[PDB]
Amino acid sequence: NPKDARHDGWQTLKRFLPYLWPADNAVLRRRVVGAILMVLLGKATTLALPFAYKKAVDAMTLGGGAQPALTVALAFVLAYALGRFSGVLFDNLRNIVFERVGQDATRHLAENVFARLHKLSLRFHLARRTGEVTKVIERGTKSIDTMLYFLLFNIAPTVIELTAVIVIFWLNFGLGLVTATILAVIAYVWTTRTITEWRTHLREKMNRLDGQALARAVDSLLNYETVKYFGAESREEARYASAARAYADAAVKSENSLGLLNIAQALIVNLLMAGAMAWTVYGWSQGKLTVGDLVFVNTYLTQLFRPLDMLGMVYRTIRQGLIDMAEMFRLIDTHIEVADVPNAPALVVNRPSVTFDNVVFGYDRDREILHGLSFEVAAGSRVAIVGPSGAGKSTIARLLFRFYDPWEGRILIDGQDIAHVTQTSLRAALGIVPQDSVLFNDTIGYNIAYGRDGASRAEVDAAAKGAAIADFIARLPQGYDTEVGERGLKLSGGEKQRVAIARTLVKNPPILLFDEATSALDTRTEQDILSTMRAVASHRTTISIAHRLSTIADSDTILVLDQGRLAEQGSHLDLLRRDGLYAEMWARQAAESAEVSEAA
Amino acid sequence: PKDARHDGWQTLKRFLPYLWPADNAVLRRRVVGAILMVLLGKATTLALPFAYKKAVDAMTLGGGAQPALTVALAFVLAYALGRFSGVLFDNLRNIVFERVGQDATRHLAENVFARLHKLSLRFHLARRTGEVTKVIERGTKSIDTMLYFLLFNIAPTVIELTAVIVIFWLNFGLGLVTATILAVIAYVWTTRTITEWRTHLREKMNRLDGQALARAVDSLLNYETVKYFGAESREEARYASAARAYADAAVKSENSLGLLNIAQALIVNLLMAGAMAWTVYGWSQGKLTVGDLVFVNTYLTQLFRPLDMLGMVYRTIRQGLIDMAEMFRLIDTHIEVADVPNAPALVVNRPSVTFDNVVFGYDRDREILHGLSFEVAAGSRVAIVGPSGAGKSTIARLLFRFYDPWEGRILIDGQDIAHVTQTSLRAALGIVPQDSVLFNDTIGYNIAYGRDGASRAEVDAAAKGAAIADFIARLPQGYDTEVGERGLKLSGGEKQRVAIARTLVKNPPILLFDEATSALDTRTEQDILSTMRAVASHRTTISIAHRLSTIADSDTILVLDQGRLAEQGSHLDLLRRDGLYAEMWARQAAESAEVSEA
Numbered sequence A: 001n002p003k004d005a006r007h008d009g010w011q012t013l014k015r016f017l018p019y020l021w022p023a024d025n026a027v028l029r030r031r032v033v034g035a036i037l038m039v040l041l042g043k044a045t046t047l048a049l050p051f052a053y054k055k056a057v058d059a060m061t062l063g064g065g066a067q068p069a070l071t072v073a074l075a076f077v078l079a080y081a082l083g084r085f086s087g088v089l090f091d092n093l094r095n096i097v098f099e100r101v102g103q104d105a106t107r108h109l110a111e112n113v114f115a116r117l118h119k120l121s122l123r124f125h126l127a128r129r130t131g132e133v134t135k136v137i138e139r140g141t142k143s144i145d146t147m148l149y150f151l152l153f154n155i156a157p158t159v160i161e162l163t164a165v166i167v168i169f170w171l172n173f174g175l176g177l178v179t180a181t182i183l184a185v186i187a188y189v190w191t192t193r194t195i196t197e198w199r200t201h202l203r204e205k206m207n208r209l210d211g212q213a214l215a216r217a218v219d220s221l222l223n224y225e226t227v228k229y230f231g232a233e234s235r236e237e238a239r240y241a242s243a244a245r246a247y248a249d250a251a252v253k254s255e256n257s258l259g260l261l262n263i264a265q266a267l268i269v270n271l272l273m274a275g276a277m278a279w280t281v282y283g284w285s286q287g288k289l290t291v292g293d294l295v296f297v298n299t300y301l302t303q304l305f306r307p308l309d310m311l312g313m314v315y316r317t318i319r320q321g322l323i324d325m326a327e328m329f330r331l332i333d334t335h336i337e338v339a340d341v342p343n344a345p346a347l348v349v350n351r352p353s354v355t356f357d358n359v360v361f362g363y364d365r366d367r368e369i370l371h372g373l374s375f376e377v378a379a380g381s382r383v384a385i386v387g388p389s390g391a392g393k394s395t396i397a398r399l400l401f402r403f404y405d406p407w408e409g410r411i412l413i414d415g416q417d418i419a420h421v422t423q424t425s426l427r428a429a430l431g432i433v434p435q436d437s438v439l440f441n442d443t444i445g446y447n448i449a450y451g452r453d454g455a456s457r458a459e460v461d462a463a464a465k466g467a468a469i470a471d472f473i474a475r476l477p478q479g480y481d482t483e484v485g486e487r488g489l490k491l492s493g494g495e496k497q498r499v500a501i502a503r504t505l506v507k508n509p510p511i512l513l514f515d516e517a518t519s520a521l522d523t524r525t526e527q528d529i530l531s532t533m534r535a536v537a538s539h540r541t542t543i544s545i546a547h548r549l550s551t552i553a554d555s556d557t558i559l560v561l562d563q564g565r566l567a568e569q570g571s572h573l574d575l576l577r578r579d580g581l582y583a584e585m586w587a588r589q590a591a592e593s594a595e596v597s598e599a600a
Numbered sequence B: 001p002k003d004a005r006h007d008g009w010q011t012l013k014r015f016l017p018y019l020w021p022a023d024n025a026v027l028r029r030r031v032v033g034a035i036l037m038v039l040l041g042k043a044t045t046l047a048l049p050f051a052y053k054k055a056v057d058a059m060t061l062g063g064g065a066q067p068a069l070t071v072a073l074a075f076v077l078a079y080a081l082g083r084f085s086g087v088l089f090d091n092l093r094n095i096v097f098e099r100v101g102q103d104a105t106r107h108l109a110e111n112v113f114a115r116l117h118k119l120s121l122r123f124h125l126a127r128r129t130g131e132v133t134k135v136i137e138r139g140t141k142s143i144d145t146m147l148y149f150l151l152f153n154i155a156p157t158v159i160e161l162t163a164v165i166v167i168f169w170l171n172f173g174l175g176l177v178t179a180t181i182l183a184v185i186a187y188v189w190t191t192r193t194i195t196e197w198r199t200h201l202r203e204k205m206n207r208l209d210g211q212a213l214a215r216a217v218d219s220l221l222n223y224e225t226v227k228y229f230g231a232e233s234r235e236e237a238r239y240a241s242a243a244r245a246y247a248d249a250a251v252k253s254e255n256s257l258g259l260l261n262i263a264q265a266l267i268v269n270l271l272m273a274g275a276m277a278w279t280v281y282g283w284s285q286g287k288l289t290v291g292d293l294v295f296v297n298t299y300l301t302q303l304f305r306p307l308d309m310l311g312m313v314y315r316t317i318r319q320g321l322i323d324m325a326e327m328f329r330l331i332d333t334h335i336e337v338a339d340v341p342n343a344p345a346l347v348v349n350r351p352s353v354t355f356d357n358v359v360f361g362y363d364r365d366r367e368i369l370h371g372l373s374f375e376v377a378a379g380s381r382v383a384i385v386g387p388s389g390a391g392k393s394t395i396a397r398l399l400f401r402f403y404d405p406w407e408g409r410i411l412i413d414g415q416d417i418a419h420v421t422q423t424s425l426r427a428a429l430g431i432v433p434q435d436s437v438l439f440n441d442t443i444g445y446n447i448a449y450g451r452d453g454a455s456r457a458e459v460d461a462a463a464k465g466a467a468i469a470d471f472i473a474r475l476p477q478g479y480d481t482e483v484g485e486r487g488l489k490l491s492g493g494e495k496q497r498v499a500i501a502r503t504l505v506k507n508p509p510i511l512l513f514d515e516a517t518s519a520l521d522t523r524t525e526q527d528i529l530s531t532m533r534a535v536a537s538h539r540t541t542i543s544i545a546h547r548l549s550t551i552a553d554s555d556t557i558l559v560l561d562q563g564r565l566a567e568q569g570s571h572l573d574l575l576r577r578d579g580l581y582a583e584m585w586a587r588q589a590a591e592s593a594e595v596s597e598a
């Protein structure tokens, strides 16, 4: 089991590897093989061509059996040029071919993570900032992609070439040459890495300061009026100038350290150039080596250290990518709190009754909210759930869609423990109008159509009518194609709740929940929409959870919760008659409504 | 001057004074230093392949292994030292000039910031923080990249290209010269056209990425809703397709990159083949040495190494020059409201406010005030009310002179506010706007904002005067409490009290409440109204309110209709005239009843 290992880069990459070698596609497997073959051809070519250079030199200095020397040299020079062009071609062909492999791989990883995120429990509250989260995911995507590219198309070939060059230097020179270049590459890597850590620290500081300056400027601009009102121009300008200066200093330091890494790098490389070319020419002096061997060794070395010119950035980015990807898998690895049981059957709603059987529950184990709540909602009946501040009614909706499970006890629909049925069918039996209805960044038509997967234009029309929002849409310039939400037309509160009613209508569920539906609304809007809602609840089981008792007074029966249990149960008149908790409540709210009316 | 072809050249010619300040002698020294490292670096890198040529020549000239060893050692060592030194010079010019670049782009930014604060309000300076920040980030990155590439890639490459024309001319060719010239021209042209096509593909690819990501994020931030309608599979499929679209776009874009590189290498290596062949054929005739093969090869590879990236460079430079142009457009846009030449200060000895037949509208095709006239006597509490077309929402902005009247004038004391310095004018005016805005800073900074050198004593006094002092007391950090986002979120009454406090610190003779209570709940309104009444103590006060009840106790009330003064007088006088104010009053009262009925 791969998860039973050390949590380092290697483990991340071993986890990512199946995405590159699917066994499910085979097309991409072919693309992978093709790409590796282009890598091998590219290396073959770039390693081959400098011998063509050497041979051209030899033919011009030992024209003893290389004759006519003109023809031999011309042949080898053209061989070399053609070699260069071909090495390039093989490289871009491996890039192009593998691009599809990379995009598909990271795409499937992204898809898996998305799915899992939609499987995890609500308690993570993934309702935050669009701009921040998007800056983060953008950042991470750029990160993982860059590490992917650098790994497959810089580090891998450079290791191939590094070993090939070791082999060739071993068989044809040295071996002092081999130990010299290996010592060289080790020093270059150690140096680049240690310096790069320092540079990454400086880089982060520069980016923090930049953010601060930009933020200052932006905050000043979006507040032009206020800056005008209090004549604070000079103040704001100076206030930006200091931040700006701070940034400039940070940037100067950062771009200086870049210079030091470059100098250290060139120092190492060019000592090795000096030493190796000296040894080669001296070796020629003794009649052991040709003059073409100078050209050969030199070209071999510059070709070797060209890709390592970027090692710093590469190292910074790859490292970071591997960090981000660890995180990806960490999410995929987090366990799912609410899961379907194995071979779960579907919920079969023949007669839509609702049962709470002794439910104990709380969002956290150190604060219990339902203390053994029990009740029966009869099929087709309309009931309400009211109670004071600790009653625990705001758990009901969430327990019913099974966003969470009870600590103890159960919830049934038609006599079926909803914890033993498939979550999708369970939620298929449920409608909800929430207090805060949210709109997708899309058209009002799409948002209404959302209630059911394959919804027709007719179904949408029918529902918008049944919610009484059809006329409002008719008067819109673009009608159903009107873009709404953020970045689009702002809808009123009543309108949004009407869209929501419409949605649940498209879904047409056998059980409907109003979960503080109108508590976000003004009084007249509430009064208006209450009639609409009253209409929609016609022949369904409906459960209304409300702060204001008056808006639910017409219930077939009312459930009164206190301290997480069922305190009172019955018709509005029975409850006012018992002079118990519901009565008290009623009275108090009434008093409030009176007092507020006086202040005019 | 500004009278030019408005092309990259004009932008750059304009940016040049920033690199050669004449105000800063130090940075001028730094520029001379950087240019000197450019010349040392080029001298060096053009020289070091001569060292290579001689070492090859030494080994082939060349009877045996004579003192050729010593010479060859000497020249290869010279070559290596040369390479290193070229790099050294390059990074030193980078380092030396970095300060120049940073200062220059800083002062340009500072100029733009400054002018933007002089330019007129009507530039709709209300958007999204993330959008403007992403934009400004984008553009600064742009200009920096464009600047670096220009100065430290294209410039040295032009220097080096000309050097190579000279050298190839004097020592070979001249067919060699014309061959490399034709090579570079084809390389440039090819790289340019392919880059234009590639930029279009890149733009498409970015749009597609954005769309896919947006779909994912909007899906997650609405987890609850997706759960409610069991729409997981649906949203997943919705992301897969957008994601595939993006992938295809990416593949296409990176393919076009492949073609750009292949074409580039074709040009470079055709030139390499021809030049090296002709060099060898020249050796065969004993005219050129064997070191000349190495020499020509090295010169050509060194020449075309910086043009390796010409694609990106050209894209980048292009965009940078665009973005910089944009900067200058701002600096060049004319300032709608200016102080007249030698404008005197406003002197407020008697704080009367006079509107004299003011005609105004934000745009010339929609007139709002059609000759508005009134006198606000010094020290009085006056309100300005009216129905939907009265034009009352203009008063505040006209009084602070965000705009001048089309016709007519505004006086404070006896003085035309269009003939005085804006700062003295605004120093005489305090304002509590409808949406009070808080800076991302401490409550102390926000209140102290009201006057430049405001003491903590003054902050205390004002916060007391606005009755928010006690609230601040119960804060852990008190006045050092960070507010705004990401800071403590304040209630509406609290924000309006911070605002009142601010204007208190200013201590102006004229105070405006501009729909001050229109964003607040009823109890909050009633609360803060008494503070607002207290604060009006020895000032001229103008309250502009939608809800008439909140201004009934004014000394006199100004009633505007269709951009003119219809009625004027005390609350009772006005109800007594049975006119417009009366009607409004009744109507408003009636509404308060209906909501109470429900």
Ligand SMILES: CCCCCCCCCCCC[N+](C)(C)[O-]
Residues within 6 Å of the ligand: A106, A107, A109, A110, A136, A137, A139, A140, A141, A144, A323, A324, A327, A328
């Ligand atoms: C799967 C390919 C693209 C996925 C996008 C990357 C996700 C962003 C990074 C997640 C968290 C990063 N970190 C470590 C800073 O928290």
Ligand SMILES: CCCCCCCCCCCC[N+](C)(C)[O-]
Residues within 6 Å of the ligand: A210, A213, A214, A217, A244, A247, B109, B112, B113, B136, B140
């Ligand atoms: C509509 C666009 C207006 C843009 C002008 C704003 C210039 C302000 C300076 C921001 C620069 C931040 N910096 C340079 C530190 O990155």
Ligand SMILES: CCCCCCCCCCCC[N+](C)(C)[O-]
Residues within 6 Å of the ligand: B105, B106, B108, B109, B135, B136, B138, B139, B140, B143, B144, B322, B323, B326, B327
């Ligand atoms: C240190 C860098 C300071 C330079 C400030 C440049 C900000 C550029 C914003 C330009 C946006 C132009 N536009 C409309 C094409 O996006």
Ligand SMILES: CCCCCCCCCCCC[N+](C)(C)[O-]
Residues within 6 Å of the ligand: A110, A111, A113, A114, A117, A136, A137, A138, A141, B209, B210, B212, B213, B216, B243, B246
């Ligand atoms: C806070 C971490 C959550 C990240 C999980 C989201 C996965 C789907 C988004 C991938 C974006 C792919 N992109 C940007 C290339 O289109």
Ligand code: MET
Residues within 6 Å of the ligand: A192, A261, A262, A265, A308, A309, A310, A311, A312, A313, A314
């Ligand atoms: C092509 S950016 C090179 C920067 C430096 N040579 C490094 O290794 O980080």
Ligand code: MET
Residues within 6 Å of the ligand: B191, B260, B261, B264, B307, B308, B309, B310, B311, B312, B313
């Ligand atoms: C990763 S640098 C690629 C440079 C490319 N040859 C161009 O000029 O666009």
